[PDB]
Amino acid sequence: SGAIYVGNYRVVNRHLATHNDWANLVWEDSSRDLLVSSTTAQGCDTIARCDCQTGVYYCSSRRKHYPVSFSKPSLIFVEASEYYPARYQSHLMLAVGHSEPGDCGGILRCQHGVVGIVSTGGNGLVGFADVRDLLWLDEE
Ligand SMILES: CS[C@@H]1CCCC[C@H]1OC(=O)N1CCC[C@H](C(N)=O)C1
């Protein structure tokens, strides 16, 4: 589990969104596994606006932050799960790192700010949903 709190927005994995997130919905995209809801309090995270392909992510199943090299956002095939059928997920970046269930929502960050959140795992790989192109998270 986990979320990004920027401005008056809460960014979560669409597959882990709560009823309150759906009742206060700003934007959602199943092809990216992302959902954004509105918040009453202001958040403290800042979004990275950069081209970093190295950073650090939080792994809840290890209580640890790991440094990783990750691929550029791309269209990647993700196996059928209990949340989605087999499909291509867009704006997904892969790295070598542990990831198991408990773990979407952990933040990936660089020196510029938050890059994205854990969205896929298994096989000694970890995948992250990029948020750096969502410029509107910085306004309103
Ligand atoms: C993420 S850990 C898990 C490890 C065992 C193998 C499967 C791994 O699950 C995933 O990759 N998922 C499940 C939740 C939805 C994700 C998505 N964004 O489509 C895909």
Ligand SMILES: [Zn+2]
């Ligand atoms: Zn950066």
